[PDB]
Structures are given as C-alpha cells and as structure tokens.
Amino acid sequence: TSLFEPAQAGDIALANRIVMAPLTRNRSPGAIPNNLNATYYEQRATAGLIVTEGTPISQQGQGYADVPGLYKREAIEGWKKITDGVHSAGGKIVAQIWHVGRISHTSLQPHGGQPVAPSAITAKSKTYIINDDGTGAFAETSEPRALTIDDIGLILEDYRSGARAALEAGFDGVEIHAANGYLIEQFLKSSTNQRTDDYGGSIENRARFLLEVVDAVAEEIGAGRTGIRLSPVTPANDIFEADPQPLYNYVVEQLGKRNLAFIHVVEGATGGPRDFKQGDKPFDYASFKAAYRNAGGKGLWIANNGYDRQSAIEAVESGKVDAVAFGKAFIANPDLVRRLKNDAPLNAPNQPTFYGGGAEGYTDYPALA
Ligand SMILES: Cc1cc2nc3c(=O)[nH]c(=O)nc-3n(C[C@H](O)[C@H](O)[C@H](O)COP(=O)(O)O)c2cc1C
Ligand SMILES: C/C(=C\[N+](=O)[O-])c1ccccc1
C-alpha cells in the first residue's frame, strides 16, 4: 500500500491517503464561512480528504471567537460554497462537528449562560473573546454548570441537527470531535467526570455519552458517512486520565461494531511529544488499534501528530496506519500532496498567523511552480 494511492473510508472515496487535519483558524466572523475561507479550502483540495476546522453544532457548543458554526442558515450556505469548490477540484471534505463543553466563556454562550459539562468543575484554560470589532481576546474559561439528563438529550438532538446540516451543506460526511479535552472527552476522563448516575463511575458508564452521540449521528446520516477523532493521552484543556488504556480499548471495541467510516487518532500530546503519558504506564497504540480490528472494525485508520514525509510513507506501507493527517504542514503548504510525491522542499508555517487575522498566513502561502 502507498501513501499516494486511493483509499476507501465508509461511503467516502479518497483519491490519496494524505489527510488535512482539522485546524481552527478563527477567520469566520459571525460564525459564518465566507469567501476568503472558500479560497483557503479550495487551494488544498488536492488532499485525499479534508477535515474542516472544528464547527460547533450550536452556540452552546462554541468556545472561541470567529469560529464557523452549523447552527445558522447563512452558515450552511457559506459551507455549501466551500464544499462545492472542493468537489469541483475533485476533493473530498468532512465537517468536524464540535462541542467544547466546559472550555468556553459566558459571552459566547446563549443568554450569557454558563458553559455545560458532565460535572461543574472549572478549567484552567484560555479563550478568544472578540471585543466589539475589535479586538481584545484572551480570557479565562468560565465556571460551568453540570448537565441534567434532559440536557444531554437536547445535546444529542443538537448533534442530530448538526449532522443533517452538514449533508445539507454538501459535506461528504462528518467527523465527531471527541478529542483534546472537550465535551465528549469531559465525560470519558476521570478528572472531569464525577457524576453519580448512568454517565459516571464505571468505564461503561463514562463511555455512554460518546456512543450515544455516535448512534444519534449515524442514525441521521448513516454509519458509512460518520467518523470520529480521539486523543487517548492528550493533556489539552486541563484534562487528566488515570488509566487511559482500559478506557480507550473499551471505546474502540464498541466502535468496531458500529460500521464507522473512519477513526482519527491523535498519537501523543496534541502539538506535543508523541510518547506523552498522563498516567503511570505508557499507551499502547498497536493494542489500541487491534481492539478496534478484533471487534470487527473496518473503518479507515487515520493517524496524526509529528509525521514527516519519511515517517508517513513507512507507516502506510507497513500497514500500521491506513492514512496520515498533517496539520501544520497543510497550513504552510496548500499543494502538500504534490510536494510530497515530488520530494520537493516544504514551506514553513508562521506561528503568529495561526489564529485570527486575514489573508496573511492563511491564503498567501505559495504553491509549487
Ligand atoms: C492552529 C491549529 C489549530 C488546530 N485546530 C484543531 C481543531 O480544530 N480540531 C482538532 O481536532 N485539532 C486541532 N488542532 C490539532 C491538529 O489537528 C493536529 O492534531 C496537530 O496539532 C497538527 O500538527 P501535526 O501536523 O504535527 O499533526 C489544531 C492545531 C493547530 C496548530
Ligand atoms: C480547536 C482547537 C484545539 N483543538 O480542538 O485541537 C483550538 C482552538 C483555539 C485555540 C487553540 C486550539
């Protein structure tokens, strides 16, 4: 198998095995995708699969300023232009439906409400908050409130709408965001979940919300158009897990029965060391993948974090992974697929222009000659 040869992810056909990781850029004021966003995505349409930046299923799911959503008619129309552009170039695109959970601020929330979480525990984290026009930004995450049983049902319903909205926006599928210490992760990990009901305590109880979200989304748009992103050992957004292995091995066993399109896995700390361990014992990724395969999982296995050209090629040829997702490299190189095939030198990303701003450090990265 080769990194540049076609792949199959559920109902979605990929031209190659190079995937664009989801990357929040904070460049959609009013939570609506615009023309500059369309150009940016169309430049990168040569990717086998494009995973969009995190897109909240509701305002409650929002946690940062200028982030495109799926809860507006205008936002769906904006997304329709982008998926049309990507499809015209022969590319494939999936929406990363998002809910931040406790990682948010009151100003972003409806009615100025508290962010929602499995348990009412405040996080030591930061947020982008726009200041009139503005700008201001940078604030502590707000004090959250604990979710009732009725609240969870309503969030599941918001996930159903988001999945429907994505297909209406012309997306090939969705990627459920269950990584980097957000709402689903908050239920999964011990440090955030101190509930005393069916969603707390045991591994089976902690995994329940994730599976309910998956089942709701798959019922709406089909399992073959549904994927999910996981990050077993990430410390992002004040989250901690004592024993990730038995917890995450259980999750993929359940997912292997679900007929999912793909499983996107962040190996190591997100934007950090790949060998990172929160607990006493290091995570076993080969064991992790096998727990999925043994349960009957046929979904495309997509790996991420710290991959270069050499490492990505070896991983696919060895069959350790089905595909590889690049984040910062796709920011700097719109024509990343062509460069990798040619073994051509790569543009370097500019950290200061990652979040907020305009065309600079966004659509002005040069392609190959
Ligand atoms: C600017 C930036 C924005 C990111 N936004 C998201 C996101 O919206 N959703 C997500 O799951 N991961 C997000 N990440 C993580 C990347 O998708 C990916 O896991 C990794 O950090 C990119 O670096 P890599 O190419 O070495 O894998 C983001 C990373 C960066 C640097
Ligand atoms: C979207 C995301 C992280 N993530 O899910 O990986 C992020 C958004 C704003 C600032 C920093 C990070």
Side-chain angles (χ1 to χ4, degrees), residues 24-330:
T24 288
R25 314 300 310 272
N26 301 96
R27 245 148 293 211
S28 296
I32 295 161
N34 48 70
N35 296 147
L36 189 66
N37 302 143
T39 291
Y40 161 77
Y41 278 113
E42 285 161 13
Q43 287 181 351
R44 286 147 184 81
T46 47
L49 176 70
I50 288 179
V51 182
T52 67
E53 59 196 297
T55 53
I57 55 181
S58 64
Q59 183 178 11
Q60 179 197 68
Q62 278 280 10
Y64 308 95
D66 288 350
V67 165
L70 282 171
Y71 51 99
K72 286 184 166 187
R73 303 303 310 171
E74 291 78 6
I76 291 179
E77 285 151 15
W79 276 123
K80 187 64 172 59
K81 299 176 180 181
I82 299 183
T83 65
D84 279 343
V86 168
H87 284 152
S88 293
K92 291 296 163 59
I93 192 168
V94 291
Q96 202 197 35
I97 55 180
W98 198 11
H99 198 303
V100 300
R102 64 180 202 166
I103 313 301
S104 185
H105 193 266
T106 42
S107 48
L108 299 164
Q109 296 297 324
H111 308 304
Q114 300 149 300
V116 295
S119 290
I121 308 176
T122 315
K124 216 188 314 170
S125 299
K126 281 292 188 168
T127 303
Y128 303 83
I129 285 122
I130 229 65
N131 184 342
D132 290 323
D133 283 276
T135 50
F138 285 152
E140 271 143 38
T141 52
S142 296
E143 226 172 22
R145 73 167 171 92
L147 288 165
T148 73
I149 294 302
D150 287 332
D151 292 333
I152 298 177
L154 291 175
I155 301 177
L156 289 172
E157 197 60 37
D158 285 346
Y159 272 112
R160 297 185 180 99
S161 299
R164 277 183 262 141
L167 292 197
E168 191 182 0
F171 279 101
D172 294 291
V174 303
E175 189 194 67
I176 296 165
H177 195 167
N180 304 342
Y182 293 111
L183 182 63
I184 303 176
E185 277 235 330
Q186 290 163 28
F187 272 97
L188 268 190
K189 321 245 186 172
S190 301
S191 74
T192 43
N193 196 333
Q194 292 184 357
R195 296 181 74 96
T196 46
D197 60 349
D198 283 350
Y199 292 90
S202 65
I203 287 183
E204 296 78 25
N205 282 8
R206 279 190 281 141
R208 186 183 313 273
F209 181 65
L210 185 154
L211 297 175
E212 282 181 354
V213 173
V214 170
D215 290 343
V217 170
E219 184 57 42
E220 291 298 310
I221 68 165
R225 267 123 77 179
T226 301
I228 191 173
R229 184 173 177 92
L230 299 171
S231 55
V233 298
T234 198
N237 294 310
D238 214 28
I239 275 212
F240 172 81
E241 171 56 41
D243 300 330
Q245 193 85 65
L247 164 65
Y248 277 88
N249 273 30
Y250 172 79
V251 173
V252 281
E253 279 156 1
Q254 303 314 308
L255 294 180
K257 317 189 209 291
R258 254 76 180 186
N259 280 101
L260 300 186
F262 60 95
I263 313 294
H264 199 153
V265 177
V266 181
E267 299 174 336
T270 302
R274 307 187 54 167
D275 60 84
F276 185 87
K277 60 172 177 62
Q278 287 205 288
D280 183 36
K281 278 121 58 174
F283 198 87
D284 192 328
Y285 288 95
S287 173
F288 183 58
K289 168 163 178 158
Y292 179 72
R293 291 303 192 216
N294 295 342
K298 295 294 169 291
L300 197 78
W301 194 265
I302 303 174
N304 170 257
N305 192 32
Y307 280 96
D308 64 39
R309 178 182 182 274
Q310 275 284 77
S311 65
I313 292 184
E314 290 154 1
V316 178
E317 290 174 351
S318 57
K320 290 178 198 163
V321 311
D322 293 342
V324 178
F326 306 89
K328 287 187 246 59
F330 252 113

